[PDB]
Structure formats: C-alpha cells, structure tokens
Amino acid sequence: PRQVARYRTDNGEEFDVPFADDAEIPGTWLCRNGLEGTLIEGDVPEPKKVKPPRTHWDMLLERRSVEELEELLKERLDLIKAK
Amino acid sequence: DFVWDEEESEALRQARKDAELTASADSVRAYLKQIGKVALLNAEEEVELAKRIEAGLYATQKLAELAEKGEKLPVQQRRDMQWICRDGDRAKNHLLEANLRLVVSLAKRYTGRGMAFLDLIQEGNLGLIRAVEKFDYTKGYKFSTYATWWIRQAITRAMADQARTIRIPVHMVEVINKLGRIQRELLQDLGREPTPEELAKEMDITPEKVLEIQQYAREPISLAVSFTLLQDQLQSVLETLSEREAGVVRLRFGLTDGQPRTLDEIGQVYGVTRERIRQIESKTMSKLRHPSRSQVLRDYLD
Amino acid sequence: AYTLQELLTIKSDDTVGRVKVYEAIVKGENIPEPGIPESFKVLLKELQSLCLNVEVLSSDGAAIEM
Amino acid sequence: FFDELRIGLATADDIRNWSYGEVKKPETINYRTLKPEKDGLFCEKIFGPTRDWECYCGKYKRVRFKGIICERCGVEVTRAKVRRERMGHIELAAPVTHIWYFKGVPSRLGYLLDLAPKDLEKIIYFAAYVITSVDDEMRHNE
Amino acid sequence: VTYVVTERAVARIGRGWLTRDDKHAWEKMRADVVGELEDHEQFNAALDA
Amino acid sequence: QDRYGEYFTGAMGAESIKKLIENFDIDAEAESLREVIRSGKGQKKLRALKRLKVVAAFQQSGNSPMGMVLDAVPVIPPELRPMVQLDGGRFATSDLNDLYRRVINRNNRLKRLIDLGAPEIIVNNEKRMLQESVDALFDNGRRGRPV
Ligand SMILES: [Zn+2]
C-alpha cells in the first residue's frame, strides 16, 4: 500500500507526497520548490527553538557596560546640540 | 625607463598571446576603480566613527526596548534618537568602504591556489565585515592591526571550504597542506621524493594513515527471457506440491515478496509451531529435488 | 522508410530496442515500434538545460505526446 | 510519432515546473565515502537514487515499494536510474540576463530596447545607471 | 608604444601593490591592458596620427 | 537622487533591464517603427526595418520577452555529468560540473551578503560576479578566455 499527504509552503503553494503506510509522516517537509512546508492537519505545533543568530547588539554588549553606552549616547547628543 | 631588450619584447609577446579577450576572473579593474574613490581614514576619524556606530546601535536597542511598555518618547528626543540610529549604519558603511584596500592586498597573497582572485577579494570583504563588527577602539590599537587577523582567517577558511571539487573539512585540508609543507623539506634534505615509511617516521603518524591522507589529497581530472521463464518454472515446479505445503516454500524463500520469513513467522501466519515449518521445509525440499519435478530447470545454471 | 529505420536503430546502437525486438521475436509477439532514441533524449535535455523550451507536438498543430 | 517540434524562450515558471528540487549547496560527495551529499549537485532525493529500488539510508530495498518515498531519506523509490532525465534548478538571489540574447551582433536585447550594445554592456555589468521611469505628470508642474 | 603604455597603466591600476610580484599577477594585468588597448579606438587613432 | 528622487526611478544591472522590459510598449513601439518604415527614405529607415525583425517576433509569435532575464537557472541531470571513479585512485569529472558549483557559491554568498546589510559596492560587485558566472556557465568564450 501507499499513503498520500498534502503540504503547503510559506509562499502559498501546495504539494502532494505519497509517503509509506506503516511510517509516521513529519510535521514539516522540504517541498519540491525548495521551501519547508507544513502538514496541513496542523497538529504538533512545536516551537522549533529558533534562536536568532548572534546579532550585532549582543556582539557589542559582550564588550561594553549598560552605563558606558548610555554615557556615550549622551555625549553624542550633547555634541549635536551645539547647533 | 627607455630600455628595450629581447626580454621586454618577449614579455609583450606573452601578454599579447596570454589574453586575446577579457576573462571573467581577471577583469577586476572595474572593482579597483570604485575603491580609489574613497580616501583613507586616520586614527581620530576611525575612533569617532566607531563611537558613532556604537551609539547608533544602543539608540536602536533602546528604541526597540521602550516599545513594549509604551513610554512614548518626546518629539525632539524621538527624532534625535532616530537620527543617531541612522548615523550608526552611516558610520558602519563609511568605515567599511574605507578599508577595501586592506582586503584586496591580503587576498592578493593567496591568488592562484585554485580559487579566483575576485572570489578571494569578496571573501576578504566578508571577513572585514566581521573585523569591523569586533574591532574595539578602547584597546588603543589601530584598525589595521586587528582586521588583518579576521581577513586572513576568512580567506583561509574560504579556501579550505571551496577550493576543491570534492569538499574536504578544514581539519583535514590542514593535514593535507602539512603533507606538502613537510615534503618540501624532506625532499630538500634527502634530494628525492621519499618513501612512505620515513614520512610516517617524520610526521609521527602510521605509514598507512599518511598514505590514506595522500590518497584523500588527490585531485579529480576532467574528461532476459530465460530469467522470466525461470520465474514461471518455479510456480510450475511448485505445482507438483500441495497448497498447504507449497505456501511454506513460498514464505521461506519469499516468493513475490522477497522477505525470508523465519520458521516461526510462517508459524504466525499459518497458526502453528515453528519446528513444524522446518519439517515442512525438509519434506518439500526432498520432494522438489527429485528429477521428476526439476527436470528442465538445470538449463539455468547461472 | 521502415527498413532503413530498423537498420539504423534496431540493428544498431540501440540497446533497449534491440532487446525488445529479440524478446518479441522469441516470444512470437509482433515487433514493437521504435522511436525516441537516447541521443535525441539527451539532446532535448541539453536544450532544456540551455533554457530553450523545446517540446514535441503531434499532427499539424496538435498537443504533446510521449 | 510526433510530427513537429518547436523551441521558445523559457520562463521561470517552466524551469520551476521541470525541476524536482533545488541544489541549495555546492557539495558533490563525501571525500572518504563516495556517497552523494544532501542538497548537493548530486543529491539523491533531487535527481533520484543511484541504485535501483533503494535509497541513501537503505531502509527500503524491495521492488514492491514502487510508489513509496523514504521517510528518513526523502528519496522516491523509482523504477530505474531516473537520474538521467530528472533535473533540478537554482533560486538565485538577483536576476541575471541570458548571455545568448545579449552578447554578439546583432544584440537582440539591445534591438528590443533600442539600446546600443556598448550602453547595454555598462548597464548589465554595473558600470552605469539607467532611469527606468520618470514622472512627467508631476515634474513639469513642480 | 604599447609596452610603455601598458607598463604605465599597470603601475597605476594596481597602485603600489603588484610591482615586481611574480608572473601570476603582473603578467595577467599586462595581458588585460594589452587586450583592451588592441581594441581601443582612440589609442589606434593616435597611433595612426 | 538626493534632489529629485521622488520624480523618477533609476537602477542598475539586470534588475533594471527587467523593469525596462516590463514597461516596454510592445504594440505601440512596433507600430511606430512600422510607420518609420513607411515614412523613412534612407539609413534611418534601414535601422527600423532591421530591428523590427526582432521587435515583431515577440508580438506576432505570442511569447513575451520576459524570458531574457532569468529568475532561476536549471541544472542538467547528473548522468549527463559523469563523476565516476577511475581505476588507480582518480575521479573523472565533467568540466561544466565545476561551472555550476562556481555559480552556487557566488549565489549563496550574495544571499548572505544581502542578509547582513553590506555596503552597496560589495553587493554590486557580487551581482556582477554572479552575472559573469552565469555567462561562463551558458557560453564560455563570449567574454573571452574562460575559467
Ligand atoms: Zn532513505
């Protein structure tokens, strides 16, 4: 035998995939168009633990204090208020 | 100056023949034109630009943070905070545009190692972005002192990642390069391309493993009717057997399914004990081996 | 036309057609029709690779086939 | 047999229709094991399996799985080496012009846009700017 | 004339960097400059003047 | 752009040619060129006559000229790119198999380079490199001696 499942991608396209009968279908599948779609039944909404990549703000905080940057911002504002 | 010799004539002849039409990797002059349009920075403007970048980043983060709780900023402060937010990326762009000469000069060293000069320049640009992100003026050192490390790291890692048709991890290409580095000195010392044993002795690794690494370092180079009848004969020969006993042979040898069902599984699907399946196998096998059943199947010798 | 076609394809470098014809002859089946050699298939695939939308149409302006 | 054949410009829709998958990564094969890499230029689930009636991880190795697609692997168990006809595509970040219609003489794109080949040389390869539209309705009033 | 012009142009294109470097850079830059010069309309017009 | 940006729109690269083709007045241009054919009396008529051969092909044949600019590039199947081993410890490869690779790299980097908000010069250089790479893929020698 053979099953069939329906998926949709973020761009709105939908796809069909004949998965196996005795296996368990994943919640997300890499569709033909290359986007990572989701199984339309909508079950098992995992958070996916999608942490953001190391950003510039953290890359700066790793070498500065919360007060020093505020003082620098105050200095810049004072500089422009020379107008 | 005004001196002409055969070497000068030969050099012109080579250049004339070495390029009849422009190549994709050698036409870097369009990029080099755009670098010259931006002047070099000194220490003072460098530190001011870095401070402006940091102030812009902090202003952006503060503006984003105040959003959840409301706390709407006043018009003057709001506008000035947004101005500094813009000024941060303005300073980032200016500092990045200033220093493309460093990445060009540093990528010039690794050219010809299997990757394009312009690709190396672009990887140097990508590393210089990280360099400007990490550079801190408080240490007192010049930007060129710090950014060279990041540019070199980016270029060498990009070479390690993309320089070969078959990708080889960084921790391997390291030892494949070490192989050539050691081989140069060993050839100089012994005056010959030496044997695996001494190479193992010098490298502190087994001869087999160094040979395997050398193999990994290699570069790719550029450029039935009887079968169907036999299947039918199986059923024809089995026709001489009873269905009850024929089924065991089908399950044991996996006729039309391929799974070699064990004696117990034939028991599970039949509903009996397993040793009985072995007994059926033996009896049916003795029956079938008789010439009266396997008469013509000998033609299928292989 | 038919004799020349079978000489150039079935009796020549066409493995699938050769085996099919041998099977048909031995089993008594009428000889299967030839068509679409591998060379044309690879040429069409390369043409598609060049972003050239090649397609084969039937009759004097009819739909595609296989 | 078919009676005629035609060729024409292929649009992004046609390329996306032909493709069974995108080659997201440049890897070809593992260095120490010659198995194809995932999402590479030799990806099995994009272009099909290399071995008949089996997949990369070997969960399925029987002919009865004709219409089955592997769970762990994603490779569609297929009748034979469909790798010869199955093809893929690339979603590239920015548009690029087709070399055949641009280079050479006459320049078909230049004739269509009435742009001299030297001018079109600069626009495509980021040497000069080109104005795509001007708001004549507003400007002459302003 | 082409050799002299090519040397002057290469010396100023690869500003300060490529001088007296191995063939892998200076020769290629020379070849590119010479190839461009051979197709250059005004350079040939001057050589014809 | 600083003074009068709101009153016009400009761009550079194939992205601008995409818009130019989008805004092309296919019928009006063809008919105006045909009128020049009926009106001109010399070289000015010859140019119109010889470029209408190209302009009309996209009108009287139905297919649009949007195909000149590619938003996607196909990949020829692997079996047409032999990558089989050679007895002796070597791998036989097809040349174009590398060209595709060179494209993908310069594509992926661009996607990363846009993501991190790099200056305009770097992105423009990357786009020029991508154009040059696709050109080499389709037809080497058009620019000159290839990779
Ligand atoms: Zn699998």
UniProtKB/Swiss-Prot annotation, chain A:
Molecular function as annotated in GO: bacterial-type RNA polymerase core enzyme binding
Domain of life: Bacteria
Swiss-Prot/TrEMBL keywords: Antibiotic resistance, Transcription, Transcription regulation
Inducing factors: Constitutively expressed during growth, increases slightly in stationary phase (at protein level).
Keyword DNA damage among UniProt keywords: no
GO biological processes: positive regulation of DNA-templated transcription; response to antibiotic
Oligomer and partners: Monomer. Forms a complex with the RNAP catalytic core, specifically with the beta subunit (RpoB); its binding site may overlap with that of Rif. May bind free principal sigma factors.
Protein family membership: Belongs to the RNA polymerase-binding protein RbpA family.
Record's function text: Binds to RNA polymerase (RNAP), probably stimulating transcriptions from principal, but not alternative sigma factor promoters. Partially restores transcription in the presence of rifampicin (Rif) in vitro; overexpression leads to an increase in the Rif tolerance in vivo, with smaller colonies. Seems to act by removing Rif from its binding site and preventing its further binding. No longer stimulates transcription in Rif-resistant RNA polymerase (with mutations in rpoB).
Name listed for the protein in its UniProt record: RNA polymerase-binding protein RbpA
Organism: Mycolicibacterium smegmatis (strain ATCC 700084 / mc(2)155)
UniProtKB/Swiss-Prot annotation, chain C:
UniProt signal peptide: none
Domain of life: Bacteria
Coiled coil: none
Subunit structure: The RNAP catalytic core consists of 2 alpha, 1 beta, 1 beta' and 1 omega subunit. When a sigma factor is associated with the core the holoenzyme is formed, which can initiate transcription. Interacts with RbpA, which partially restores Rif-inhibited transcription.
Annotated family: Belongs to the RNA polymerase beta chain family.
More details: Mutations in the RRDR sequence (residues 423-449) confer rifampicin (Rif) resistance. Rif blocks transcription initiation but not elongation.
Protein name: DNA-directed RNA polymerase subunit beta
Lineage: Bacteria, Bacillati, Actinomycetota, Actinomycetes, Mycobacteriales
UniProtKB/Swiss-Prot annotation, chain D:
Coiled-coil spans in chain: none
Highest taxon in the source lineage: Bacteria
Residues that bind Zn(2+) 1: C55, C57, C70, C73
Family: Belongs to the RNA polymerase beta' chain family.
Function: DNA-dependent RNA polymerase catalyzes the transcription of DNA into RNA using the four ribonucleoside triphosphates as substrates.
Subunit structure: The RNAP catalytic core consists of 2 alpha, 1 beta, 1 beta' and 1 omega subunit. When a sigma factor is associated with the core the holoenzyme is formed, which can initiate transcription.
Name of the protein described by the UniProt record: DNA-directed RNA polymerase subunit beta'
Organism: Mycolicibacterium smegmatis (strain ATCC 700084 / mc(2)155)
Whole sequence portion shown: 6 to 147 of 1317
Curated annotation (Swiss-Prot), chain F:
Protein name, per record: DNA-directed RNA polymerase subunit beta'
First and last residue of the signal peptide: none
Stated family: Belongs to the RNA polymerase beta' chain family.
Function: DNA-dependent RNA polymerase catalyzes the transcription of DNA into RNA using the four ribonucleoside triphosphates as substrates.
Quaternary structure and interacting proteins, as annotated: The RNAP catalytic core consists of 2 alpha, 1 beta, 1 beta' and 1 omega subunit. When a sigma factor is associated with the core the holoenzyme is formed, which can initiate transcription.
